[PDB]
Design a protein around this ligand. Structure first.
Ligand SMILES: O=c1ccn([C@@H]2O[C@H](COP(=O)(O)OP(=O)(O)O)[C@@H](O)[C@H]2O)c(=O)[nH]1
Ligand SMILES: OC[C@H]1O[C@@H](O)[C@H](O)[C@@H](O)[C@H]1O
Ligand SMILES: [Mn+2]
Length: 291
């Protein structure tokens, strides 16, 4: 049950003026695409606070990636779901290396120890299995948000993202035609998408939804990866390839614009991006991913 919103004073939405004319703001299956200028965060904060919404945020910090936790968590504290209840779950092979970050009221952090895998491909892939900690999330949070660690929040990332199932547009492909998307293209892979299918290229690094829908997604991607292994094939972009196939066949109820995961070093700051909210931290691939 959802009590009445209190009286609020805000700009009237006008039917005969779009919030943004430069970008697509709803998908052909009527899911909002979340850009700056599309949402009144005051209205959304009300609706979500009245529900006493708790958001879990998952983050893997295995081997050398523990170094990214301090900036990731301190900037989450400045910009992620502020004012709402938040439960961070830090999955790591080095519990003692998790930095001591001071949290705002109503926010908590759990350290979950997991095995490290040698191959960075396997570390990335096995997130899906490790997420799908099954009874725990169900009892502790309403939504789960699953992101990469080698990132920092620079601007607001709040309840406008929450919905049963969301993906995020990959910042390198939001302008491309589908034939150029780097979907898995070999029909022997569970992740296979033919050249005339596909809505968008979503990122492995930022997806989420209700606990129920995230567990479905992560369970399905984990089972598909297990079939490919048995068949001696490994998807071209690993977990991200399977996530793309899943979201093709199970349409997300919201899509986040590339404001929600950007790399300014590689792509600059285009006019179409009014805010850069959560962004890649520079890293040396070869050195950070190997002993
Ligand atoms: O040695 C590793 C490699 C990967 N990761 C986790 O897997 C994620 C995805 O890998 P990465 O960020 O290296 O992929 P990229 O964004 O460069 O494609 C990282 O954000 C970490 O959360 C990790 O913890 N340790
Ligand atoms: O083509 C897909 C790839 O694009 C790169 O820009 C990215 O760093 C990879 O992790 C993967 O998403
Ligand atoms: Mn990353």
């Amino acid at each position: 049950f959802m009590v009445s919103l209190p009286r609020m004073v805000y700009p009237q939405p006008k039917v005969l003026t779009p919030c943004r004319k430069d970008v697509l703001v709803v998908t052909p299956w009527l899911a909002p695409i979340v850009w700056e200028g599309t949402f009144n965060i005051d209205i959304l904060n009300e609706q979500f606070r009245l529900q006493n919404t708790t958001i879990g945020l998952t983050v893997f910090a295995i081997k050398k990636y523990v170094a990214f936790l301090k900036l990731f968590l301190e900037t989450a504290e400045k910009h992620f779901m502020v004012g709402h209840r938040v439960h961070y779950y830090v999955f790591t092979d080095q519990p003692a290396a998790v930095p001591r970050v001071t949290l705002g009221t109503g926010r908590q952090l759990s350290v979950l120890e997991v095995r490290a895998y040698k191959r960075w491909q396997d570390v990335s892939m096995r997130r899906m299995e490790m997420i799908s900690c099954e009874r725990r999330f169900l009892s502790e949070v309403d939504y789960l948000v699953c992101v990469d660690v080698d990132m920092e929040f620079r601007d607001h990332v709040g309840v406008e993202i929450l919905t049963p199932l969301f993906g995020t547009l990959h910042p390198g492909f939001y302008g491309s035609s589908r034939e150029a998307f780097t979907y898995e293209r070999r029909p022997q892979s569970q992740a296979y998408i033919p050249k005339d299918e596909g809505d968008f290229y979503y990122l492995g690094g930022f997806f989420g939804g209700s606990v129920q829908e995230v567990q479905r997604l992560t369970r399905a991607c984990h089972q598909a990866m297990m079939v490919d292994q048995a068949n001696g094939i490994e998807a071209v972009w690993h977990d991200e390839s399977h996530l793309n196939k899943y979201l093709l066949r199970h349409k997300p109820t919201k899509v986040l614009s590339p404001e929600y995961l950007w790399d300014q070093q590689l792509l600059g700051w285009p006019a179409v991006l009014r805010k850069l909210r959560f962004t890649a931290v520079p890293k040396n691939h070869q050195a950070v991913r190997n002993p």
